[PDB]
Amino acid sequence: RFLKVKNWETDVVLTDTLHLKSTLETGCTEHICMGSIMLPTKDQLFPLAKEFLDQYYSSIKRFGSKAHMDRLEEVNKEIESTSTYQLKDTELIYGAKHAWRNASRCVGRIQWSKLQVFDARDCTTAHGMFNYICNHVKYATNKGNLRSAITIFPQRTDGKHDFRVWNSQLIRYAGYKQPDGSTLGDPANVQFTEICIQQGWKAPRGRFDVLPLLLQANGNDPELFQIPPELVLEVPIRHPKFDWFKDLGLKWYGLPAVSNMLLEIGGLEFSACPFSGWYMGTEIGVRDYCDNSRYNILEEVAKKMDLDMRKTSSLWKDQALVEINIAVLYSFQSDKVTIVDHHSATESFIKHMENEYRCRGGCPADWVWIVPPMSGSITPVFHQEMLNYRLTPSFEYQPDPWNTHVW
Amino acid sequence: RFLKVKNWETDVVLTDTLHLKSTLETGCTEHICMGSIMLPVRTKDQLFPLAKEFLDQYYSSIKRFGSKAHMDRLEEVNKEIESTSTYQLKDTELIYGAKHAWRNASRCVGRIQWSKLQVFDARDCTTAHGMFNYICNHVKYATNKGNLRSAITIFPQRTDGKHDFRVWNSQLIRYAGYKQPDGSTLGDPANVQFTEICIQQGWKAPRGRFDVLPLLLQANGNDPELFQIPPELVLEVPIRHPKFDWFKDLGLKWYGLPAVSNMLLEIGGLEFSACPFSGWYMGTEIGVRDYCDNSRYNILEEVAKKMDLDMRKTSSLWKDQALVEINIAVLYSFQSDKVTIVDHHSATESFIKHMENEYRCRGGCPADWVWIVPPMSGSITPVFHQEMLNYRLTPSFEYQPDPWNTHVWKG
Ligand code: HEM
Ligand code: HEM
Ligand SMILES: C[C@H](O)[C@H](O)[C@H]1CNc2nc(N)[nH]c(=O)c2N1
Ligand SMILES: C[C@H](O)[C@H](O)[C@H]1CNc2nc(N)[nH]c(=O)c2N1
Ligand SMILES: CSCCCC(=N)NCCC[C@H](N)C(=O)O
Ligand SMILES: CSCCCC(=N)NCCC[C@H](N)C(=O)O
Ligand SMILES: [Zn+2]
Numbered sequence: 080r081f082l083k084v085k086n087w088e089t090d091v092v093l094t095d096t097l098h099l100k101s102t103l104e105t106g107c108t109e110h111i112c113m114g115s116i117m118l119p120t121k122d123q124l125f126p127l128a129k130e131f132l133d134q135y136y137s138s139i140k141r142f143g144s145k146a147h148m149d150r151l152e153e154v155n156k157e158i159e160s161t162s163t164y165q166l167k168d169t170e171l172i173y174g175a176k177h178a179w180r181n182a183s184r185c186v187g188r189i190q191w192s193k194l195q196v197f198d199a200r201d202c203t204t205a206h207g208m209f210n211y212i213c214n215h216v217k218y219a220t221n222k223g224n225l226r227s228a229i230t231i232f233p234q235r236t237d238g239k240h241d242f243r244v245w246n247s248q249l250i251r252y253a254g255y256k257q258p259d260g261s262t263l264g265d266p267a268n269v270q271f272t273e274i275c276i277q278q279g280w281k282a283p284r285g286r287f288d289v290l291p292l293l294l295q296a297n298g299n300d301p302e303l304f305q306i307p308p309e310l311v312l313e314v315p316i317r318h319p320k321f322d323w324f325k326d327l328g329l330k331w332y333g334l335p336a337v338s339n340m341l342l343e344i345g346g347l348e349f350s351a352c353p354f355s356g357w358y359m360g361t362e363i364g365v366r367d368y369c370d371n372s373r374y375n376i377l378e379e380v381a382k383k384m385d386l387d388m389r390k391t392s393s394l395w396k397d398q399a400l401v402e403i404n405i406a407v408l409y410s411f412q413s414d415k416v417t418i419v420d421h422h423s424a425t426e427s428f429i430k431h432m433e434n435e436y437r438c439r440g441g442c443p444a445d446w447v448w449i450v451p452p453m454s455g456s457i458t459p460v461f462h463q464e465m466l467n468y469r470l471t472p473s474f475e476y477q478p479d480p481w482n483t484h485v486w
Numbered sequence: 487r488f489l490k491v492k493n494w495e496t497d498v499v500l501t502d503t504l505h506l507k508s509t510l511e512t513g514c515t516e517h518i519c520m521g522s523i524m525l526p527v528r529t530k531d532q533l534f535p536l537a538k539e540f541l542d543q544y545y546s547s548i549k550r551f552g553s554k555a556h557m558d559r560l561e562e563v564n565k566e567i568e569s570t571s572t573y574q575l576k577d578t579e580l581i582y583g584a585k586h587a588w589r590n591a592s593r594c595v596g597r598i599q600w601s602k603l604q605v606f607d608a609r610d611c612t613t614a615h616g617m618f619n620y621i622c623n624h625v626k627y628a629t630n631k632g633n634l635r636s637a638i639t640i641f642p643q644r645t646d647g648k649h650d651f652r653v654w655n656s657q658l659i660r661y662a663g664y665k666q667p668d669g670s671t672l673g674d675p676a677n678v679q680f681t682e683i684c685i686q687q688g689w690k691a692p693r694g695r696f697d698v699l700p701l702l703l704q705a706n707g708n709d710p711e712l713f714q715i716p717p718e719l720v721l722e723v724p725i726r727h728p729k730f731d732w733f734k735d736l737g738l739k740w741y742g743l744p745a746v747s748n749m750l751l752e753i754g755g756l757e758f759s760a761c762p763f764s765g766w767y768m769g770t771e772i773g774v775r776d777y778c779d780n781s782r783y784n785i786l787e788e789v790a791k792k793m794d795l796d797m798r799k800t801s802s803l804w805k806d807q808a809l810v811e812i813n814i815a816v817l818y819s820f821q822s823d824k825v826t827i828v829d830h831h832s833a834t835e836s837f838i839k840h841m842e843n844e845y846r847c848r849g850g851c852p853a854d855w856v857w858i859v860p861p862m863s864g865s866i867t868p869v870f871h872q873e874m875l876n877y878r879l880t881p882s883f884e885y886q887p888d889p890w891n892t893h894v895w896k897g
Contacts, residue, residue, distance in 0.1 A: 087524065088780050098518050107514035107521070111505050112876035114514070114521025115855035117494065360801075365865050371495050377866065391831035392769075392817050397810045397863045401803055408801050422800040446522035446856060452865030454806045456774055457786070461861060467519040 086429075088462035093433070095466050097441030102130070103469035114467065115447055118476060121162055127346025128154050128164060131472070135173055163236060165200075166344060172196045174344030174472045175229050179354075181470040184448035186424055186460070187356050189431035195219075195228040202232055205294035205302040208242070212292060212353065216249060216310050219355045220334050223312060225417040229354035233297075234347045242351035243480045245293035245301050246271065249336035249353055250311055253288040264288060266372050274481060279303055287313075287330055295351075300486060314414050318406040323383050327376065331363045331407070333416040341477040350477060357417040359424045361451045364404035376403070400453055421451035425458035432463070443468045493838075495871035500842065502875050504850025510878035521876065522856050525885055527647045528755065530571055536755025537563050537573060540880070544582055572645060575753065581605045583753035584638050584761075587881040593857035595833055595869070596765050598840035603763075604628075604637040611641050611651070614703040618713040621658060621701060621762065625719050628764045629743055632721060634826035638763035642706075643756045651760040652889045653747040654702035654710050656680065658762050659720060661741075662697040673697065675781055683890055687712055696722075696739055704760075704889065709896045723823050727815035732792055736785065740772050740816070742825045750886040759886065766826040768833045773813035774861045785812070809862055830860035834867040841872070852877045 082095040106119025113119045129151065136147040150167075157164040166174065180191045195218070199211045211230050219228040232242035247268070254269035256262060262269065264286055272290065276282055280291050280303055289311055295301035312333040318324035336355035341348055368374045377399050381388055384402065386395040411418035419427075428449065435442035444465035455461045489502040513526025520526045538560060545556040566573040575583065589600040604627065608620040620639050628637040641651040656677075663671055663678035671678065673695050681699065685691055689700050689712055698720050704710035721742040727733035745764035750757055777783045786808050790797055793811065795804035820827035828836075837858065844851035853874035864870045 082518075084523070101517045104516045105514065105519045107512065107519045108516060109511040109514065110508050110877060111489075112512045112514050112519065112521045112854075114519045114876070115874045116491070117873065369866055370871075392821065392829045394810055394814050394817070394829070396831065396866050397813070400863060400866055401806045401810055404806070405803050408803070412801070420801040420803070422803075422805065445519075450864070452870060454803075454809060454862050455859070455864050456861030457778060457805050457809060462779075464524060465522045467521070468517060 082466060084464035084466060086459070086463045088459060091433075093436040093441075095436070095441035097435075097439055097470070098443070098466055098468045100470065101443075101468040102471050103473070105467065105469065114445075121158060124163070124346045125155060125158055127471075128158065131174070131345025132170075134177075135170055138173065163234070163347070166347065168198060171198055171200075171231065171344070175231065175342065175352075178342055178344065178472040178474050179229075181443060181473050183443040183445040183467050183469070186359065186428045186449050186451075187419075188442075189427045189434075190227060190356070193227055195226060197228065197230040199230050200233050202242070203296060205296045205299070205304070208232065208244070208294040208296055208351070209292060209304040212244075212249060212294075213307060213310055215353065215355070216306065216334060216336070219336070220310065220312050223333065223414065223416040225334065225355075225357040227354075227356050229342075229352060231342065231349050232351035234349050240298035241295070241480075242297065243295040243301070243484075244338040244351050244353055245274070245295060245480055246290060247337070247339045249292070249338050249355070250306070250332045250334055251290050252286075252332075253282060253284075253290050255282070255284055265367075265374065275303065286328070289332070295480065295484070301480075301484075312416060314410050314416055316406055316410045317413075318402060319409045321383075321402065321406070324406055327379065327383075329368070329374075329376070331367065333358075333411070335362065339477065339479070340474045342472070343475055344472045352474075354474075357419065358411070359419050359421055359451065360404055360408045360411070361421045361453055364407040365400060365452045368403055368407075369400060404453065421454065421458055425449075425451065425460045429459045429463060432465075441466065443470055489875060491873035491875060493868075493872045495868060498842070500845040502845065502850040504848055504879075505852070505875055505877045507879065508852075508877045509880055510882070512877065521854075528757070530567055533572070533755045534564060534567050536880075537567065540583070540754030541579075543586075544579055547582060572643070572756070573754075575756065577607060580607060580609075580640060580753070583881045584640065584751065584763075586879075587751050587753065587883050588638075588763075590852065590879040590882050592852040592854040592876050592878075595768065595837045595858050597851075598836045599636055599765065602636065604635060606637060606639040608639050608641045609643070612705060614705045614708070614711040614713070617641065617651070617653070617703040617705055617760070618701060621653075621703075622715065622719060624762065624764070625658060625715065625743060625745070628745065629719065629721050632742065632823065632825040634743065634764075634766040636763070636765040638751075638761055640751065640758050641760035643758050648894075649707035650704065650889075651706065652704040652710070653760050653762055654680070654683070654704060654889055655699060656746070656748040658701065658745040658747050658764070659715070659741045659743055660699050661695075662691060662693070662699055664691065664693055674776075674783065684712065695737065698741070704893070707894075709893075710889075721825060723819050723825055725815050725819045726822075727811060728818045730793075730811065730815070733811075733815055736788065736792075738777070738783075738785070740776070742767075742820070744771070748886065748888070749883045751881070751883055753881040761883075763883075766828065767820075768828050768830055768860070769813055769817045769820070770830045770860045770862055773816035774809065777812055777816075778809060813862065830863065830867055834858070834860065834869040838868045838872060850875070852879060 084093050106113040136142050154164050175196050176194045215230045235241050252265040253272045254265045292304045293301045313330050316329035335358050338353040341350050342352040368376050381395045381399040387393045388395050432442045445467045446465045449460050490499050492499050513520035545551045563573050584605050585603050624639045661674040662681045663674045701713045702710045722739050725738040745762050747762035750759050751761040777785050790804050790808040796802040797804050841851045854876045855874045858869050
């Protein structure tokens, strides 16, 4: 019921007590570990509301004070009569920062408390949403000096009136199926790209076409909007020694902003809550460029480096993977767009884990996601035991809205 | 209950029914996953059900479930258990048993080979000298002048846990580690503790960077004894690089035969506390972990200097660059000297096919993603993209405590 985690590179040993306040379920049993699976009422709402305010008031050292009990009565009162309730600003800010704090898949959490929260609960329309969104994109982009932010749309009510950003990220490239069999652009987005055109988008049909936003306000059909180009900071990708690299004509966007997750604070569900930080290099260079089901450029790059592709044992895919990632980090740096390499991002996360053990009694963490997808064991997180558990408030996955939405 | 695992690269979904046949706990609960945690005397009463379960599996695999030969073996094991408090495996059962322990080994990416495993039965062994002789023959047979062959050697099972056979080495061939007075380590820091023990037991240490350790062998619960493996039986490979001529001058070599000697093999409830087994290396085991862990030979800095990489900012990926060249060199050196080795692309690709075949034919393949995914270039190998279910089948290889921590010394 108290647990040890050990780092096998440093023999440092940490004691987790924070898992005892774990709420949700992992997907694992004593018989079977699912640690590698990607996706593993008035009466319901009150316990949730309670548990949350208890967390809040304890954090500001007013646990069991007049103001505590009072707000607790107030929220019951509201639950009893409205069937939902509304968070104060301070609770909304706390709830969101804590949801990032509890995101066990997130290596970037040393930054958790500096989150800038934009309260968009007064929004009513997709045009409204589009405005909030551009203001978020501009504030977080900050001409390259990126800053954490989240924008929070109104919470669900009857689930017939949901706010949803249909895009999976605010800024992503289109995917088009082609006559020859293959795919132009980004294969991950192929289906959303069909939906845009099927909702009315004129697509330019290139390799790096910034998708339009598809926004659903208050349960209505969603609407199309094009993000002002001047707000999409993009980096052309070159290499500090390979001349011919720029002739692949690769570019990437500077602002990663996940837009399809659900935020749960004290039993309340915020289905549209786009958030953003900045990239660790490997995300683009290893996954976006090199996954077979993504841009998949390893073959071409190795072709230009004149490496021996005649057998796997020359490690040509590995040599190329390195140079590709050198060319992402260098390009972003040369243009001064915040970016972090996997080495210092992981070292920071170790520091963050230590802090969290010391001050909070633990730090939930999902090893499978924290260890970068190249050079794993030469980052310190590889040697670090982690405990994974689900704390609230949290970010949750939710089904792609087109599967749910009724027209 | 059926369980689905998706490969996110290919969209292949597979259905696991095999996890139903599962016994031992995982370490995880519904409230916590311990999937990254490294390590999360038996009564008559509890022995017969285990015996029985195993024999049921056995007779099913040879298509004689419920036969007279099956029923009689049950009854004969039952009777032996009641009368002697333990029981003896037939040869055929032991072979089947050791093979399955390998097939069930969820952290092993090499399992496509499971069915081609040479089992040497050393259950007639009585002494340490007897052990050394068995081990030597294992090393020579498995080495096979560089064309490696997988093999395991099985010493007598535990009885009252006061007469245990153990190999005190963690691998049969491994290199000394020596802590110097200045705090530095000469050789392999993984093996310093065991190296001290050897010296204390009377080993005269050469004290170089690559001294093959002597064997430390315990028979019948007796104090263990030292033996030098004959050097002619120790296949070693100097490491060089196909393009970097200064690479030989780092003075690196490695041994060709990886042979884990500290695990416990469990079959039908019986415990074989000494069962060294060997296969061959995947290149990343040496080139990433053995050479480049900070707590092992730690050569990254030295290789990066010699490459003249920019080491001022980690964002040069000088570490990633050096690491690839080192793994190239390990693969190149082994292939040149005709010693079996496998790269992590080829190994993980093989494992994927093994895994899919295991689902079709067995209804599952327990796998530990944390271990199966290589420690470099994870996502460009297809396992990274493969959902896996981890659960504990028997027969199995288990961890056991280091014997110096448990052994009662005779004097
Ligand atoms: C500030 C710099 C940040 C860095 C460097 C960073 C880094 C990362 C990385 C590398 C991942 C894995 C992503 C993937 O493999 O697709 C991730 C996942 C995640 N991050 Fe962070 N992050 C940052 C900020 C944030 C913020 C501001 C939030 C929320 C406020 C957040 C919440 C999450 C969540 C919920 C996941 C898992 C997402 C999923 O399951 O797809 N991150 N992060
Ligand atoms: C045939 C060639 C083989 C290859 C390429 C192979 C590959 C590997 C690799 C790379 C590992 C991870 C090792 C580490 O990180 O230290 C491993 C683990 C393991 N393998 Fe295999 N293996 C082979 C043969 C065998 C055999 C013959 C057995 C038993 C009969 C076996 C049983 C295991 C076990 C029990 C583990 C986990 C060890 C631990 O928990 O420390 N392997 N294997
Ligand atoms: C099957 C496996 O769970 C899947 O490939 C995971 C592995 N680790 C990951 N880690 C990160 N950071 N992001 C990912 O998308 C994934 N994918
Ligand atoms: C904490 C963590 O589980 C530990 O570093 C594991 C990670 N994955 C591994 N994977 C393999 N194959 N071998 C190892 O020794 C390890 N070490
Ligand atoms: C967006 S919030 C998490 C912090 C931002 C980030 N660094 N990445 C997360 C998802 C982006 C995805 N891996 C990609 O390569 O586009
Ligand atoms: C003996 S069991 C598996 C067959 C041999 C093997 N391929 N790996 C075992 C572990 C070797 C260790 N990782 C090392 O680098 O020495
Ligand atoms: Zn688990």
